[PDB]
Enzyme design. Structure first.
Site, PDB file in Angstrom:
ATOM      1  N   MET A   1     -35.668 138.124  29.543  1.00 46.01           N
ATOM      2  CA  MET A   1     -36.320 137.044  30.280  1.00 46.01           C
ATOM      3  C   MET A   1     -36.387 135.788  29.396  1.00 46.01           C
ATOM      4  O   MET A   1     -36.535 135.854  28.172  1.00 46.01           O
ATOM      5  CB  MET A   1     -37.731 137.486  30.707  1.00 46.01           C
ATOM      6  CG  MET A   1     -38.519 136.448  31.546  1.00 46.01           C
ATOM      7  SD  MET A   1     -39.452 135.272  30.535  1.00 46.01           S
ATOM      8  CE  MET A   1     -40.949 136.178  30.420  1.00 46.01           C
TER       9      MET A   1
ATOM     10  N   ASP B   1     -47.834 139.411  27.916  1.00 47.11           N
ATOM     11  CA  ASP B   1     -48.193 138.018  27.729  1.00 47.11           C
ATOM     12  C   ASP B   1     -49.656 138.047  27.235  1.00 47.11           C
ATOM     13  O   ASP B   1     -50.629 137.993  28.017  1.00 47.11           O
ATOM     14  CB  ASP B   1     -48.001 137.226  29.027  1.00 47.11           C
ATOM     15  CG  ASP B   1     -48.089 135.736  28.822  1.00 47.11           C
ATOM     16  OD1 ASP B   1     -48.194 135.369  27.641  1.00 47.11           O
ATOM     17  OD2 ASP B   1     -47.984 134.971  29.813  1.00 47.11           O
TER      18      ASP B   1
ATOM     19  N   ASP C   1     -58.606 131.887  30.589  1.00 47.97           N
ATOM     20  CA  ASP C   1     -57.531 132.876  30.513  1.00 47.97           C
ATOM     21  C   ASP C   1     -57.589 133.526  29.117  1.00 47.97           C
ATOM     22  O   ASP C   1     -57.247 132.892  28.086  1.00 47.97           O
ATOM     23  CB  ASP C   1     -56.234 132.146  30.828  1.00 47.97           C
ATOM     24  CG  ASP C   1     -54.993 133.040  30.768  1.00 47.97           C
ATOM     25  OD1 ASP C   1     -55.010 134.188  31.239  1.00 47.97           O
ATOM     26  OD2 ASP C   1     -53.961 132.518  30.273  1.00 47.97           O
TER      27      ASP C   1
ATOM     28  N   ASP D   1     -46.292 140.619  33.889  1.00 51.39           N
ATOM     29  CA  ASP D   1     -47.029 140.305  32.636  1.00 51.39           C
ATOM     30  C   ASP D   1     -48.315 141.164  32.513  1.00 51.39           C
ATOM     31  O   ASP D   1     -49.187 141.137  33.381  1.00 51.39           O
ATOM     32  CB  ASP D   1     -47.434 138.841  32.583  1.00 51.39           C
ATOM     33  CG  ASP D   1     -46.290 137.884  32.191  1.00 51.39           C
ATOM     34  OD1 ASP D   1     -45.122 138.316  32.020  1.00 51.39           O
ATOM     35  OD2 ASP D   1     -46.589 136.656  32.119  1.00 51.39           O
TER      36      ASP D   1
ATOM     37  N   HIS E   1     -54.424 136.714  35.355  1.00 49.05           N
ATOM     38  CA  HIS E   1     -54.443 135.562  36.287  1.00 49.05           C
ATOM     39  C   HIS E   1     -55.080 135.845  37.667  1.00 49.05           C
ATOM     40  O   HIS E   1     -55.881 135.033  38.187  1.00 49.05           O
ATOM     41  CB  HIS E   1     -53.062 134.957  36.430  1.00 49.05           C
ATOM     42  CG  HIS E   1     -52.588 134.344  35.162  1.00 49.05           C
ATOM     43  ND1 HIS E   1     -51.327 133.843  34.982  1.00 49.05           N
ATOM     44  CD2 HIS E   1     -53.237 134.172  33.980  1.00 49.05           C
ATOM     45  CE1 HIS E   1     -51.217 133.401  33.729  1.00 49.05           C
ATOM     46  NE2 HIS E   1     -52.374 133.594  33.104  1.00 49.05           N
TER      47      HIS E   1
ATOM     48  N   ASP F   1     -56.044 136.489  27.913  1.00 45.36           N
ATOM     49  CA  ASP F   1     -54.826 137.091  27.329  1.00 45.36           C
ATOM     50  C   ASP F   1     -55.116 138.200  26.242  1.00 45.36           C
ATOM     51  O   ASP F   1     -54.482 138.238  25.187  1.00 45.36           O
ATOM     52  CB  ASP F   1     -53.920 136.007  26.781  1.00 45.36           C
ATOM     53  CG  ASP F   1     -53.236 135.239  27.859  1.00 45.36           C
ATOM     54  OD1 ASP F   1     -53.382 135.552  29.079  1.00 45.36           O
ATOM     55  OD2 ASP F   1     -52.488 134.330  27.472  1.00 45.36           O
TER      56      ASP F   1
ATOM     57  N   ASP G   1     -39.865 127.473  21.723  1.00 44.16           N
ATOM     58  CA  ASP G   1     -40.344 128.438  20.731  1.00 44.16           C
ATOM     59  C   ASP G   1     -39.192 128.695  19.732  1.00 44.16           C
ATOM     60  O   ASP G   1     -39.401 129.150  18.620  1.00 44.16           O
ATOM     61  CB  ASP G   1     -40.624 129.790  21.331  1.00 44.16           C
ATOM     62  CG  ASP G   1     -41.758 129.812  22.344  1.00 44.16           C
ATOM     63  OD1 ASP G   1     -42.682 129.033  22.175  1.00 44.16           O
ATOM     64  OD2 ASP G   1     -41.717 130.672  23.282  1.00 44.16           O
TER      65      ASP G   1
HETATM   66 CA   LIG Z   1     -52.759 134.388  30.853  1.00 44.01          CA
END
Ligand SMILES: [Ca+2]
Ligand SMILES: [Ca+2]
Ligand SMILES: [Ca+2]
Ligand SMILES: [Ca+2]
Lengths: 387, 387, 387, 387
Positions: free
Chosen positions: A87, A286, A254, A244, A219, A256, A56
């Site tokens: 992190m 996240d 997922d 997260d 998750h 998010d 990134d």
């Molecule tokens: Ca996720």
């Protein structure tokens, strides 16, 4: 009100606000963000820090001198804003070479390369002051049964993590590892699919004290599991190294979503838990602002993550301090749950006739738990309806 | 063909063929079976043995002399048929007193009673020659967040299991414990919801070597998880003490269909695994003949459990012995998965320029895994289509 | 505050507060309630009325004179309290004879009996003043593929419903039918599994105007579907005849939690919809107080159903009346969604060059939807955080 | 054996074998395929034809003369191989302009553009000889409750489809429409989420006879629904215009595995149904070769789709022709299911005392359905174990 400050420890990945909105069926809806601009914009909103994958921050394939440049500019931004980097993690999923995994790729040369790409980023993370290094095994798994012998793969996963351990120990780095579990996507089934599987695997590593979990709300919910129950097991084991936070609507891809979206009540029970247990790590989001949104919606979505945590924290505190709730907790025998079953010991138990031979099972059976009264008080506190 | 014999080690709970067909919406469709008649009927079909809860064998509340009688009659049946009893368990779920749990009930007096009811049955299990004592915490959990502090509950669950351990150790019994996980039903969320959560909890008990898992096909599937992957993790950890075999169609109520029903391919990959790993425990069926069936359908359903295991075993053996499959496994680099990533060690890895600096990532990326060819060979073997 | 009155039209089935807590793994935890006592207790709490299955009111197998007695006592209770009976239904699931279904049982004699048991109860429902007669096909389906030819079964289901239609038409009764969908449990898969399947089937009945849906919150959620979206489709079709309100935590066994439990946000969006659309039918709770509870917890659970509806109604009204929300709705183009795409007609569209040939697709692409800002305003209203 | 020929009517989308393997977390693993090369390669494998989105064939933004060129080259390939084009569809999901939908975008100008892009491709489809035009509303829906008024959206969806109907009717084209349902992904919830919702919506269009469904195996399974039951309802309604065949492992992201992968038994029951009902449309594979694979694995995956259909067809035929199965079907009363419940009519039923007053309910209750025997015969036929 509900104004975040750096003391709340809210952090965001660069890849979150930076998500260009490319999904499996569509192109990007937003232009790339410069890492420096995200650090500035996030500082203004009240975040404490940012997190990053190697890729990134440093475009894949950059020369050493471009690398140095990219790091220098980012460091200047952190210095300018007071933002921390608690992190970091490695991208072992985007490049085609990782299509069958990193640490558990069937091809040995790829597994070697994954370890080397990981170690180079651990050095950079320590330089930036990260305390936690996350591993998300998103390509480690299979779409078909014969493709992946899971015993051998777990041998390879143990091997990779034990090597990483050896590296940080030999370099005298004060960093620990956290595994981010996910049950599926982008592989049909991913290895170490839940917090439980990750916690069990860690106990077989050579130095288990260096490894914990980075569970994600969405998750565990992709497996239909209760996230606060899962976090409680992680806290009980002493392994909640990071978390997260985000939102997910049940069992599907997922999502998010921003924190507080998805299962709102589970979000309340989670904040209640984190705050009562004294969790002092980062509150990391996240999440992906939906691809419907322009840049103004990106910053609104991020601000909302933080807002919902702080509203939930106030309502959980109010619930626990309410004398009427305290008495309900006693009516439901939560106090008794916390007392040892048999501190008198096994022989005392066996000789105790009130435990069996003269135990009135029908009278014990008749006592109501009063859980529904308790739960509706919790409902009224969440909704601000104890007026 | 596909005729089971006692050497195949097929076992059945008394509560399986004995299920009267009472479900949440309807009354019993079949009369009660005498335990003696099930032992006879199962022996005739080729089973190796039976398993029991205390309450299946000895009606709850029986006096000592009725108890003795019930045991004597059952023992006569085992002697008459050659049937063994390799496993037993306690009913800590039916009686109203266990409505908030056994070992983790909020009420301390109930937790004491659960421990005493359990110990009395451990003695009987050892007398009958059981090697494994199963615990299914079906009432341990919650429908609402405030009802159950999960940290305290895990303290109570650890306490109960450590006491049981102390008991068997002090009596010099050669029995071990296995936890049967289930994610939900009949509680909204059940504690230790998956094989992973159970494996992680066992590592915190005082004598972890006495405890393992009894995973059930349908339970892991109720969380959307890959059952063979979960069994592989349990085998890797050395904790597969027993197994429950049955069928389940996805994420919904616990179906307990006959083995081979439900997810057929996952059944094939499971048998392949059990047989390749040399699993030598019992092949136990925790299933319910559907309430549509009369007594003839009950015995047909049970016979089918065994039949499907033996057809699946033959097809898995044929797949692994096929030279064409062996070569496909090499084409997909399964052989490389089994070789250490870095047996040369960490400094050798770091100095190895072919692992990073001169690694041709694009050439590695271009190599196909050939997994779909492998999987269709596995499909052709399952279906008997390699003619 | 949030005090229900009869004008809110809150209704409860007798089987709800009357649930004795027998589940698939355990015995009853509460004694049977007399129907008369439930009518009195519910009146005191502020309910508008009750609903019943034939068998809840008249014990199965009662003689005509016992039947008359049971009805007389219940009628006296309705007269004493002012409670109404707006809906009734038939028990075609408990007795063993219905193990393969009622209307779609493979056995023709059972299908005849189901129709006769149903018609006798329609007469009683009309006598008590019910406007809606519900059918829940809980035993109509299969655990295995060969057991049920679905085309033939849908012929039998159409046949049964067309006969019922003929009966009410010939008797000149002013009652309509509503189908309550559920995707599974107690059968492995149930026919007409969702609101959509039920709506499509109704269009093939001989008099479709007599039939609609009685969707239940928890049922649609057992398939992972968005309940407010499903209710919107039913409202759009003119088929929302009744509704069942309760709570469910995702994809698993049918929980029947109190309304407001489970997915809280979906509960808010549902109330917003019902109230904005002007839904004027009963607000019926098909819920089960958890078996943990004694009689005091039963009445608390029921009171909470009503409380949560009224808190949610106030928060939804506040959201829609907020001028800041009104402007956000415009910013997100909700106003444009309501305007016809092409009221100018098809030839005008085809000749319109601003629709294609000169449409600036990149400028349209760049406009943000501002949905996240809107959603966080909705979050702040729900939580009472627009202070 | 199991060699497909063009007479089997196997078709594939260009986007299937052409999928470059870009998923939400990774870059393409395979280079773009020229449409001409896919038509040649598919012809060699034994397919009957191909299907296309406008944008798969004509790069978005092509001038008229490039368009003409692209079509000419593709037509030459169809002529060279004998390949047909029985279906086509529009891409209303990739370009950023469709981020909030096509036909139900909040922005009216986008809805106009979607209609124009669709009509231009209907003309091309007819020119190539397509009989069916598919609509997949993948962007039609929402991630949050306030973003999409579902009633208004269904008005806009009805409007778009009625306009399309008007267009084909006015041009005298012999094409019909089929809606491909999907419950979620890439939107959080997609409108018309299942076959049932799509079938119900079609009955409110102005010319319902022009519209049917194109159900996909994996989509219905993403809601936990039984796909053969859903296809049976579509066949019963006369609306199965086309079908998408593939594999899916339960409730998660849309896998698009090769047909026969995923739920194998549901695949058998589907083929049994399609073949027994005489379905004569195309057998289309909407699948993605996994991104692990190179070009050799792409063609193997596609060949396997066809192979598994033909093995399943042989096993289903063998099951239905087996006299032992025929007798089991009678033992389970499948013959009775097909006979009218009350061809004698409603008054005859009401006067018939053997239907109620003298019906022996306990004797009817005692009869076993013998479904488990039937199902194991079906198991033995699938596996080739009736030797
Ligand atoms: Ca996720
Ligand atoms: Ca089970
Ligand atoms: Ca329900
Ligand atoms: Ca799909």
């Amino acid at each position: 009100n509900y104004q975040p400050t750096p003391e709340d420890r809210f952090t965001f990945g660069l890849w979150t606000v930076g998500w260009q909105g490319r999904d499996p069926f569509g192109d990007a809806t937003r232009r790339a963000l410069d890492p420096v601009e995200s650090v500035r914009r996030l500082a203004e909103l009240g975040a404490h820090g940012v997190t990053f994958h190697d890729d990134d921050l440093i475009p894949f394939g950059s020369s050493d001198s471009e690398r140095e440049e990219h790091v220098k500019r980012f460091r200047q931004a952190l210095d300018d804003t007071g933002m921390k980097v608690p992190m970091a993690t490695t991208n072992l999923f985007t490049h085609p070479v990782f299509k069958d995994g990193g640490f558990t790729a069937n091809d040995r040369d790829v597994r070697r390369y994954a370890l080397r790409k990981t170690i180079r980023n651990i050095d950079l993370a320590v330089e930036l002051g990260a305390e936690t290094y996350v591993a998300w095994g998103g390509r480690e798994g299979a779409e078909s049964g014969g493709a992946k012998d899971v015993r051998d793969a777990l041998d390879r996963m143990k091997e990779a993590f034990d090597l990483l351990g050896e590296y940080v120990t030999s370099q005298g780095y004060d960093i620990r590892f956290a595994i981010e579990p996910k049950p599926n996507e982008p592989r049909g089934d991913i290895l170490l699919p839940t917090v439980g599987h990750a916690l069990a695997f860690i106990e077989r590593l050579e130095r288990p004290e260096l490894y914990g979990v980075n569970p994600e709300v969405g998750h565990e919910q992709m497996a239909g599991l209760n996230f606060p129950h899962g976090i409680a097991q992680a806290l009980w084991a002493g392994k909640l190294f990071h978390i997260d936070l985000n939102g997910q609507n049940g069992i599907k891809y997922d999502q998010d979503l921003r924190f507080g979206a998805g299962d709102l009540r589970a979000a309340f029970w989670l904040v209640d838990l984190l705050e009562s247990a004294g969790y002092s790590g980062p509150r990391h989001f996240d999440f992906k602002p939906p691809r419907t949104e322009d840049f103004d919606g990106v910053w609104a979505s991020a601000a909302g993550c933080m807002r919902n945590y702080l509203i939930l924290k106030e309502r959980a505190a109010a619930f626990r301090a309410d004398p009427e709730v305290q008495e309900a907790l006693r009516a439901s025998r939560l106090d008794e749950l916390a007392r040892p079953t048999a501190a008198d010991g096994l022989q005392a138990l066996l000789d105790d006739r009130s435990a069996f031979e003269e135990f009135d099972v029908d009278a014990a059976a008749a006592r109501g738990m009063a859980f529904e009264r308790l739960d509706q008080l919790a409902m009224d506190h969440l909704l601000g309806a104890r007026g």
